[PDB]
């Protein structure tokens, strides 16, 4: 099988630099043209850069939006492709995919956030009132992402986790869960919130008022 293992993503302030790496395996890397593609809500899928194979002279093309700021390169002996990103702007924010063999293979993507806003852990607040709906409010964090589970994932149905919304340079997200009302508060309901960027891992029990 093919693996495209990206790394080097994260949060950087505007004017800063990041270097993305993609380690490829499961295909003959020396024959492959490789591409970087990024994704954002506002601009959708955008081709960033192409680098051809050795026989095609490792020829390189860039999207005009990144010309002069981004550099693609490859190391065939390490089966790896790279994207050096300089002079980063807010609009360079998005998921960056390593793509192999002219868009046949895609990596899982790495999130690149370009903002002046600093890393901030969420405040996690319980939302308590035949079925009962409960929730947790995951407020004031940066950057994305956060994950939310209920009862360590064992409460898998009944759950809606809402896309986070950026206001005041901070994200806010909510999640709901529905359980039989006979089971609450007698049985404990816990929302588990992880924010890797701030190494935050918290469990918030939903207690009655």
């Amino acid at each position: 099988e093919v693996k495209l293992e990206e790394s080097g993503g994260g949060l950087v302030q505007p004017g800063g630099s990041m270097k993305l790496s993609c380690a490829a395996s499961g295909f003959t890397f020396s024959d492959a043209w490789m591409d970087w593609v990024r994704q954002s809500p506002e601009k959708g899928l955008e081709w960033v850069a192409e680098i051809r194979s050795k026989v095609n002279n490792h020829a390189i093309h860039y999207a005009e939006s990144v010309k002069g700021r981004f550099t693609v390169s490859r190391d065939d002996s390490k089966s790896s492709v790279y994207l050096q990103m300089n002079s980063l702007r807010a609009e360079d924010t998005g998921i960056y995919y390593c793509s192999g063999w002219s868009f046949l293979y895609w990596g899982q993507g790495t999130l690149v956030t370009v903002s002046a806003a600093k890393t901030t852990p969420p405040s996690v607040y319980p939302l308590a009132p035949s079925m009962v709906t409960l929730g947790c409010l995951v407020k004031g964090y940066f950057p994305e992402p956060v994950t939310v589970t209920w009862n360590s994932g064992s409460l898998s149905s009944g759950v809606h986790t809402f896309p986070a919304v950026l206001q005041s340079d901070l994200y806010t997200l909510s999640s709901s869960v529905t359980v039989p009302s006979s089971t609450w508060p007698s049985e404990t309901v816990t929302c588990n919130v992880a924010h890797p960027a701030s190494s935050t891992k918290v469990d918030k029990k939903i207690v009655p008022r």
């Binding site: 899928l45 899982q108 405040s123 409010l137 809606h160 809402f162 896309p163 909510s174 008022r209």
Partner: protein, 210 residues
Amino acid sequence: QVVLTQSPGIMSASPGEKVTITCSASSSVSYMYWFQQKPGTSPKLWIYSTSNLASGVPARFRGSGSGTSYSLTISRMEAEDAATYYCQQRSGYPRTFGGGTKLEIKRADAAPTVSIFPPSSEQLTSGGASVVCFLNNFYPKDINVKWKIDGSERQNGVLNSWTDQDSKDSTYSMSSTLTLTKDEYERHNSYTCEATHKTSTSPIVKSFNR
């Protein structure tokens, strides 16, 4: 740069229905390529060189077209086909993608389940008061939420968020958060969210008193 315009931007279908989505290029291209994406995962090559199915793509799918006009056809749709499909051209540089066609699942209408939540004691201690309204599991996706404080409509300070179609029951959900300071929140008694949805002529109203 070739501009790819996909039609429709969004549509719903029932399993068994024929689905045709189109890509129009600003200038002619030799071939169109198509990609499938589902939320939370990477795009997958779906069709290459206009009409070739990628490995694993079922025979229901057919790519066609020429010049500036290309299509992706599903002969008989399956629920698993609900996704966003992007066209892409590689006839020069830059490579470009269309804006996507989102194919959703058609289902029966469903009224929102509405739940209002007071600020938590712990948030109040911080000087904050977020009131949260969930509008859960409704169909179709269009809905309006109204906030009222002591019976008077409140606009400003409202954070709204909408889910994608639920992969289980094919419904939509919405969350609405009214954030106040603790001081303003304690200045008032009653807090109300009202959901307007095509399933009822009258709004669904949930409220709490401090």
